Amino acid sequence: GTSQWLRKTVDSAAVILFSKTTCPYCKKVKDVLAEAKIKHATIELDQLSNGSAIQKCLASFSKIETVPQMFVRGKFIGDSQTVLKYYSNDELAGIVNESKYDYDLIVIGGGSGGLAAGKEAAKYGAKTAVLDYVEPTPIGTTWGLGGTCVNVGCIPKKLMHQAGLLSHALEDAEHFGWSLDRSKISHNWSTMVEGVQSHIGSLNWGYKVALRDNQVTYLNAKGRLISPHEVQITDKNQKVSTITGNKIILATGERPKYPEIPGAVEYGITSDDLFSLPYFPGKTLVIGASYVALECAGFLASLGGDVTVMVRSILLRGFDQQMAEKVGDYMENHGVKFAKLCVPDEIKQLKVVDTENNKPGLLLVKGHYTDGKKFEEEFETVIFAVGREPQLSKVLCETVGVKLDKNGRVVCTDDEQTTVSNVYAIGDINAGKPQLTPVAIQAGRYLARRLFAGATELTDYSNVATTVFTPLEYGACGLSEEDAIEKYGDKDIEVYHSNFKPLEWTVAHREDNVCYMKLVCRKSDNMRVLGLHVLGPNAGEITQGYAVAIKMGATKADFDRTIGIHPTCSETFTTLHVTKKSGVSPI
Amino acid sequence: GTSQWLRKTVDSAAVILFSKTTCPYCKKVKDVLAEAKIKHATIELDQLSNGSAIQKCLASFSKIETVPQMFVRGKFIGDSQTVLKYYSNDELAGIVNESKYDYDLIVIGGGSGGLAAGKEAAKYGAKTAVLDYVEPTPIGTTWGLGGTCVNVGCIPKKLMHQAGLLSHALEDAEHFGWSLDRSKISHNWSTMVEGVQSHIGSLNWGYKVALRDNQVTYLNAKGRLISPHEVQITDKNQKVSTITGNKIILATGERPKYPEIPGAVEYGITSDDLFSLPYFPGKTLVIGASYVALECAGFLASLGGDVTVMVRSILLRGFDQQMAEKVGDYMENHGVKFAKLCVPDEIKQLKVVDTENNKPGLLLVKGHYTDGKKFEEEFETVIFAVGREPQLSKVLCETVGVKLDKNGRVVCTDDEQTTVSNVYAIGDINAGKPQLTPVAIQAGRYLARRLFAGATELTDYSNVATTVFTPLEYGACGLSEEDAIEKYGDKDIEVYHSNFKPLEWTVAHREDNVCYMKLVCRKSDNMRVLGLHVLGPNAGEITQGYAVAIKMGATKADFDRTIGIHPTCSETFTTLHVTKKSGVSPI
Ligand SMILES: Cc1cc2nc3c(=O)[nH]c(=O)nc-3n(C[C@H](O)[C@H](O)[C@H](O)COP(=O)(O)OP(=O)(O)OC[C@H]3O[C@@H](n4cnc5c(N)ncnc54)[C@H](O)[C@@H]3O)c2cc1C
Ligand SMILES: Cc1cc2nc3c(=O)[nH]c(=O)nc-3n(C[C@H](O)[C@H](O)[C@H](O)COP(=O)(O)OP(=O)(O)OC[C@H]3O[C@@H](n4cnc5c(N)ncnc54)[C@H](O)[C@@H]3O)c2cc1C
Ligand SMILES: O=S(=O)(O)C[C@H](O)CN1CCN(CCO)CC1
Ligand SMILES: O=S(=O)(O)C[C@H](O)CN1CCN(CCO)CC1
Ligand SMILES: O=C(O)c1ccc2cccnc2n1
Ligand SMILES: O=C(O)c1ccc2cccnc2n1
Ligand code: NA
Ligand code: NA
């Protein structure tokens, strides 16, 4: 079926050139396009394990069987002579710019995926437009280009995580001989925010420049897909116009949920507001129990905040629950209070946010524990981190025919195509995909390659590694222990585990047997590593590399015959020997 | 050749039991041995892809073809009935303790390998003795059980590395909002040493306990191999006696070299003395340019020391030299001065080490740069880190027949066997092996398994990963770029690289385009990753996991289809696209 790949490639590509590596006439075309700064994909049949079939099938479109053959938007343009002619006649610019639509690609959403897809697309000649609009939060918070991660996600989250960790670094420096009294050091929230925001500001700027430098049109406008090839844009001045595109990528991401209770929208905040908050939250109630709730509670606590987490049911639903308990136990043991089995009922305002002195308001939270007791406590800030939801009624008219799941996420095929053929969805809105920035980036860039460069490589959403940046980080790749057990049976699952202690925690006099790691393996598949789990410092760095081995089908034996790097936390994976079925202690 | 494996196993094993998983009579023997606390290897023919051949060949030794068959030191002991009998007759203790020699194993050297091998051996019934003696340094420095790593190596080295890094953590805490003036914080060397030494002291203690709890005999005595099965020990009281062992493991490690120049032994020190030094080195000259020299210079500089490094030729001979230059450039740019192309000629004493106030002496170093200029400078401490050499004339009489290479290291086969059949060498003295603690541990434990438990798995010394814990850490796994180019040719080597900036360095206002990583790949082998190189924080944690993938034959494509964890340094390996042959900037 090489025929069909060529049909799809030639159709969607904006400017593509078929060629061979060592080719006299092809290089004559390349040199011309370069001089005229005409960006284009290039397929080297020379370097393809089926290029002979392609070069012939190519005559289905060109009537010709020789390279170089140049195409513009499903349309053959000519051999060497015909191109050199267009150029010499100064008509080559107009030939490559012909198009039914204003753009080869319109990306609705200027975040991790949208920017990645849009930047990669222009690399291969796609006349591309990126649309981004940040609907303000209920209290007015807004921000610039870059998406959730850049502005109110991974980036500020980790920076404030890092500011938190330095709390422990300041405590440790004493044991390591530095002459500072941890007791006499405070943290200024505003100084931290100003630095975080300065860096986000440079990222906002950097993306705008990246789009300008790649001839990508950046529109700060709310995009609405009204027909498969028509996008309606409302700009800052409420001016409505319409633009057309061949391919459409939906990448509008999500936004925080608010529980439907009185005072929540009016008096509480979310992650969207926290990372630029002009005042220190103060005594803070985080409502929620997944990774945003615990990350935010973690660094607020480490930055000297009185922090409470309200847990309806469990921590980190969908994560390995043994790890989640270990995560929570560390936070409980380092300040964060947990109001277990507890749901809010209303948020009464007691003080308005003092905009003068940048100080938080004051709130009364009325709730109830599940055992009947009434929760009634005062907090200066209440943060909802109870989930995130797509906002696609604002992006689609169901007129168009983009099928959404029950959760409002776009239903796609394994190539991110929607039920409308020219329309794709990447990132958080793509149903059932892990909602992570590098996933959105990869999906976007790989999708861009298939459309405008004839690539075939799909994105592999399996065994995507992750790290919860709680005070004690938790990295994972693969199945939770309970999922593997459920998927294959207790009897087919062996679990190697060990506690460990960072060497840095020895002189610092931090805890024995708190850090912990485990490999979840399948006995009947050569002890294949199904899931990897590490609770410890720098769990992100630890886990990443193993995600390569796991994608390759790593077994327990592949870990054992690797030699550790000493001294590191990560090396504990190369010497795991205690199993769970044996009952021996992982200490 | 299952015959030969069984011959070797039965001969060397101390107490071994052949059995099947689901076996009535075998479990009757196990239960007896457990009750009597008789440690033993156990081969489950049930679980071996050739156990049928073994169970028959077994009758070569027992005259019997059924399980359970128990052997003691090359000698069949009996089926179920014969064992249950010995036990009931209370003669089973004496049967398993019969031996021509005092010990099944004598380990000469109580360090990383020796302790690992000795502990693993006793696990399988080996009547084991571990010998350790720390010959004092020229100035009298000595230490307890554990080896180079524990006492004067990885452990104190990394702890002082960590104390150094906190210097930058204290600077950064300000930008992240913490109210401390880095300018007004000093470091006390003695407090750090006391904490490092307290932890080493607990390790010294922990190993002694580990050996006691595993019925291993620990002798604090200098061992000398005088005949294949006889070891001569000189204890603390100069009392000479002799002990016999079936198997001998040489694991005596190495010690620092001193250059043959006046004043070096008398007035300078080495790594062996640095990590317990009662006084801060002060203005320090490190003589040497490999990983000890730069690690020690790095943290001395970060701890407020005026530090100079004397480089005869190049930094990190045998490492990727591009990385080494990047390593050195970072140290040069953060305090450490380099006296390039410079060799010392004498060390004159100007002040004696003040033992009263714990203050360093004072020294005059006379040298010459290669361009003729005379080096003449005063330093409070001079540290030689110019290499390490084995000390085996003190451990062997060439009488015995252990072949040593030209460098004095034991020449071994791929199973660590020496030219004397019962004698093995692990760790730094094993010629041509990477001189690293986890290598010595693995070699030791795997060797112990082959001897006393019938294992066959050899240690894999290929693509062993490593990390130089310089101020900016440098992790590597596989070939340097120059080695791969040399081994396969420039044309067959593609190098993907990228600079990067830790997110933590943004608010901290540290350097752009200093951190750096590269994959060295072979074009003609599916872009196999031949070497991995990362200069950046926590390079140990970053590199470890990738060492598993590389051992598995990871390609560039295996990296690309792995999804990054964001935000981390390590994730930059999953998106590498700039090559060197292209000349594009890695910024
Ligand atoms: C607190 C928090 C912390 C996180 N930490 C991590 C982490 O550590 N590691 C990780 O991998 N992931 C993390 N994530 C997830 C990560 O942010 C998302 O996976 C990533 O942002 C998804 O990229 P995207 O393009 O799909 O959506 P987004 O990044 O949200 O981009 C969507 C853009 O399109 C805009 N938009 C919406 N509708 C329209 C419209 N009609 N027209 C124009 N623009 C529109 C949106 O306002 C936004 O600017 C975190 C998320 C949060 C909320
Ligand atoms: C400053 C320094 C830093 C290092 N950092 C790292 C690192 O970060 N990561 C890493 O992987 N490796 C590191 N190493 C290397 C590591 O220490 C060695 O690879 C490891 O110690 C080797 O273990 P071994 O058993 O072979 O030798 P050793 O650990 O040296 O043990 C040998 C023991 O036997 C003793 N001995 C010698 N002769 C006799 C005798 N006749 N009788 C009885 N005992 C004897 C010795 O005194 C010693 O106690 C470092 C080394 C140094 C010097
Ligand atoms: O392959 S899986 O679907 O098993 C896992 C995905 O690749 C990535 N994960 C990341 C973590 N998520 C929830 C916490 O484990 C689920 C999706
Ligand atoms: O497989 S190799 O022999 O190529 C490498 C070894 O496995 C481990 N290395 C670690 C670093 N060493 C010198 C610096 O690269 C050489 C041995
Ligand atoms: O969609 C997911 O499964 C998902 C999304 C975001 C995550 C963040 C940290 C840890 N795990 C995560 N999992
Ligand atoms: O023997 C070796 O090759 C060897 C020994 C020790 C090392 C320490 C850090 C980095 N590399 C190293 N390499
Ligand atoms: Na989003
Ligand atoms: Na040694």
Enumerate the residues of chain B whose CB falls inside 8 A of the CB of residue A436: 563, 566
Cβ-proximal residues to B163 (8 Å cutoff; 6+ apart), any chain:
A173, A176, A177, A178, A507, B187, B192, B299, B302, B303
B24, containing H or E segment: helix B24-35
Q: Which residues sit opposite B437 in a β-bridge?
A: none
Query: What Cα–Cα distance (Å) separates residue B251 from each residue in B143, B216, B223, B424?
Result: 17, 16, 11, 9
User: A310: helix, coil or strand?
Assistant: strand
Q: Which two tokens stand for residue A150?
A: 């850049």
DSSP codes of every residue in B526-556: TTEEEEEEEESTTHHHHHHHHHHHHHTT-BH
Q: Cβ atoms within 10 A of the Cβ of A155, count?
A: 24
Residue B410, ligand 2, Cβ within 6 A: no
Chain mean position to CA B400: 27
How is residue B354 annotated by DSSP? B
Rounded to 5 degrees, what angle do the CA atoms A207, A211, A216 make? 155
Q: Is A506 on the interface with B (CB under 8 A)?
A: yes
Q: Which of residues 517-556 of A touch B (CB under 8 A)?
A: 538, 540-549, 551-552, 554
Q: Where are the beta strands (DSSP E) in B283-404?
A: 284-287, 307-311, 337-340, 342-351, 362-369, 374-379, 381-384, 388-390
What is the Cα–Cα distance from A316 to A310, expressed in whole angstroms?
Answer: 13
Show the DSSP H helices in A255-369 as ranges. 264-267, 271-274, 291-302, 321-332
If you search the block for the tokens 């798995």, which residue do you land on? B457
Q: Cβ atoms within 10 A of the Cβ of A567, count?
A: 23
Query: Phi and psi of B286, rounded to 5°?
Result: -95, 125
Cβ-proximal residues to B482 (8 Å cutoff; 6+ apart), any chain:
B320, B321
Burial class (CB in 10 A: 0-12, 13-18, 19+), B145: buried
Q: Which of B72, B155, B140, B147 is nearest to B117 (CA)?
A: B147
What is the Cα–Cα distance from A548 to B550, expressed in whole angstroms?
Answer: 9
Q: Do A173 and B159 touch (CB under 8 A)?
A: no
Resolution in A: 2.5
Q: Which of B241, B248, B255 is nearest to B114 (CA)?
A: B248
What is the Cα–Cα distance from A273 to B174, expressed in whole angstroms?
Answer: 23
Length of chain B: 587
Q: Cβ atoms within 10 A of the Cβ of A209, count?
A: 10
Q: Do A566 and B149 touch (CB under 8 A)?
A: yes
Cβ-proximal residues to B176 (8 Å cutoff; 6+ apart), any chain:
A159, A162, A163, A166, A191, A192, A195, B507, B508
Taking the CA of residue A154 and the nearest CA in chain B, the distance in Å comes to 6
Q: Which residues sit opposite A339 in a β-bridge?
A: A310
Taking the CA of residue A542 and the nearest CA in chain B, the distance in Å comes to 5
The CB-side HSE value for B497 (13 A sphere, CA atoms) comes to 27
Type of residue at B216: V
Type of residue at B316: L
Q: Which of A35, A54, A44, A36 is nearest to A16 (CA)?
A: A44
- 8 Å CB contact between B216 and B130: yes
What is the Cα–Cα distance from B301 to B164, expressed in whole angstroms?
Answer: 8
What is the Cα–Cα distance from A331 to A295, expressed in whole angstroms?
Answer: 10
- 8 Å CB contact between B476 and B466: yes
Q: Which of B511, B485, B508 is nearest to B500 (CA)?
A: B511
Q: Which of B469, B463, B524 is nearest to B491 (CA)?
A: B524
Q: Which two tokens stand for residue A325?
A: 């308990």
How is residue B360 annotated by DSSP? -
Distance B288 CA to ligand 6 centre (A): 15
Lay out the sheet containing A374-379: strands in order across: A342-351, A362-369, A374-379
The CB-side HSE value for A524 (13 A sphere, CA atoms) comes to 9
Report the residue of chain A nearest B172, measured CA to CA: A166
Chain mean position to CA A9: 28
DSSP codes of every residue in A239-257: -EEEEEEEEEEE---EEE-
How is residue B97 annotated by DSSP? H
Q: Do B436 and A563 touch (CB under 8 A)?
A: yes
Query: Phi and psi of B504, rounded to 5°?
Result: -65, -25
Q: Cβ atoms within 10 A of the Cβ of B405, count?
A: 12
Q: Which two tokens stand for residue A12?
A: 């969607």
- 8 Å CB contact between B245 and B219: no
Domains for chain B: give ranges and CATH numbers: 1-100 (3.40.30.10), 101-256+387-462 (3.50.50.60), 257-386 (3.50.50.60), 463-587 (3.30.390.30)
Q: Is B195 on the interface with A (CB under 8 A)?
A: yes
Q: Which two tokens stand for residue A265?
A: 């929208």
Type of residue at B499: N
Q: Which two tokens stand for residue B587?
A: 């910024």
Q: Which of A184, A192, A190 is nearest to A165 (CA)?
A: A192
Burial class (CB in 10 A: 0-12, 13-18, 19+), A359: middle
Measured torsion, CA atoms of residues A480, A482, A487, A492, in degrees rounded to the nearest 10: 100
Cis before residue B68, ω within 30 degrees of 0? yes
User: A520: helix, coil or strand?
Assistant: strand
**Experimental technique of record:** X-ray
Q: Which two tokens stand for residue B394?
A: 């003190």
What is the Cα–Cα distance from A473 to A322, expressed in whole angstroms?
Answer: 14
Residue in A149, A155, A405, A435 to alter for ligand 5 test, most ligand atoms within 8 A of Cβ: A435
- Helices and strands (DSSP H and E) totals, chain B: 19, 26
Q: Which two tokens stand for residue A510?
A: 């931090």
- 8 Å CB contact between B169 and B471: no
User: A43: helix, coil or strand?
Assistant: strand
What is the Cα–Cα distance from B103 to B217, expressed in whole angstroms?
Answer: 9
What is the Cα–Cα distance from B504 to B176, expressed in whole angstroms?
Answer: 9
Q: Which two tokens stand for residue A252?
A: 């509008």
Rounded to 5 degrees, what angle do the CA atoms B284, B288, B290 make? 120
Q: Is B149 on the interface with A (CB under 8 A)?
A: yes
Q: Is B171 on the interface with A (CB under 8 A)?
A: no
Q: Cβ atoms within 10 A of the Cβ of A321, count?
A: 15
Give which of B49, B150, B166 to mutate to test A binding, by max A Cβ within 10 Å. B166
- Helices and strands (DSSP H and E) totals, chain A: 19, 26
- 8 Å CB contact between B59 and B5: no
Q: Calculate Rg over the CA atoms of chain A.
A: 27
How is residue B214 annotated by DSSP? T
Strand-pair category, A493-500 with B381-384: unpaired
How is residue A359 annotated by DSSP? B
Q: Which of B278, B281, B255 is nearest to B268 (CA)?
A: B281
Q: Which residues of B314-324 are buried (b: 16+ CB within 10 A; e: fewer)?
A: bbbeebbebbb
Give which of B159, B441, B565 to mutate to test A binding, by max A Cβ within 10 Å. B565
What is the Cα–Cα distance from B565 to B542, expressed in whole angstroms?
Answer: 12
Q: Which two tokens stand for residue A378?
A: 């005062």
What is the Cα–Cα distance from A22 to A489, expressed in whole angstroms?
Answer: 56
Q: Cβ atoms within 10 A of the Cβ of B22, count?
A: 8
Chain mean position to CA A77: 39
What is the Cα–Cα distance from A170 to A173, expressed in whole angstroms?
Answer: 5
What is the Cα–Cα distance from A428 to A392, expressed in whole angstroms?
Answer: 12
Is B566 marked active-site? yes
Q: Do A566 and B437 touch (CB under 8 A)?
A: yes
Q: Which of A548, A544, A467 is nearest to B541 (CA)?
A: A544
Show the DSSP H helices in A492-555 as ranges. 504-507, 539-551
Enumerate the residues of chain A whose CB falls inside 8 A of the CB of residue B111: none
Cis before residue A68, ω within 30 degrees of 0? yes
Measured torsion, CA atoms of residues B562, B565, B571, B575, in degrees rounded to the nearest 10: 50
Q: Which of B248, B154, B135, B240 is nearest to B196 (CA)?
A: B154
Measured torsion, CA atoms of residues A27, A33, A39, A45, in degrees rounded to the nearest 10: -20
- 8 Å CB contact between A114 and A4: no
Q: Which residues sit opposite B243 in a β-bridge?
A: B231
What is the Cα–Cα distance from A329 to A340, expressed in whole angstroms?
Answer: 12
Q: Which of B475, B539, B435 is nearest to B154 (CA)?
A: B435
What is the Cα–Cα distance from B123 to B448, expressed in whole angstroms?
Answer: 9
Q: Which of A68, A61, A55, A58 is nearest to A17 (CA)?
A: A68
What is the Cα–Cα distance from B68 to B19, expressed in whole angstroms?
Answer: 5
Cis before residue B537, ω within 30 degrees of 0? no
Distance A519 CA to ligand 2 centre (A): 30
3-state secondary structure labels for all residues of A424-438 = EECHHHECCCCCCHH
Q: Which of B129, B128, B125, B127 is nearest to B34 (CA)?
A: B125
- 8 Å CB contact between A242 and A257: no
Burial class (CB in 10 A: 0-12, 13-18, 19+), B156: buried
DSSP codes of every residue in B421-436: TTEEE-GGGBTTS---
What is the Cα–Cα distance from B473 to B459, expressed in whole angstroms?
Answer: 27
Report the residue of chain A nearest B150, measured CA to CA: A567
Strand-pair category, B128-131 with B103-108: parallel
* Residues of A taking part in catalysis: 566
- 8 Å CB contact between B409 and B429: yes
Show the DSSP H helices in B399-479 as ranges. 437-453
Cβ-proximal residues to B23 (8 Å cutoff; 6+ apart), any chain:
B46, B67, B68
Length of chain A: 587
Q: Do B465 and A543 touch (CB under 8 A)?
A: no
Looking at all shown ligands, the one closest to residue B146's CA atom is 2
Which residue minimizes the CA distance to atom 12 of ligand 5?
A466
Q: Do B195 and A177 touch (CB under 8 A)?
A: yes
Q: Is A139 left (phi over 0), alpha (psi -120 to 50) or beta?
A: alpha
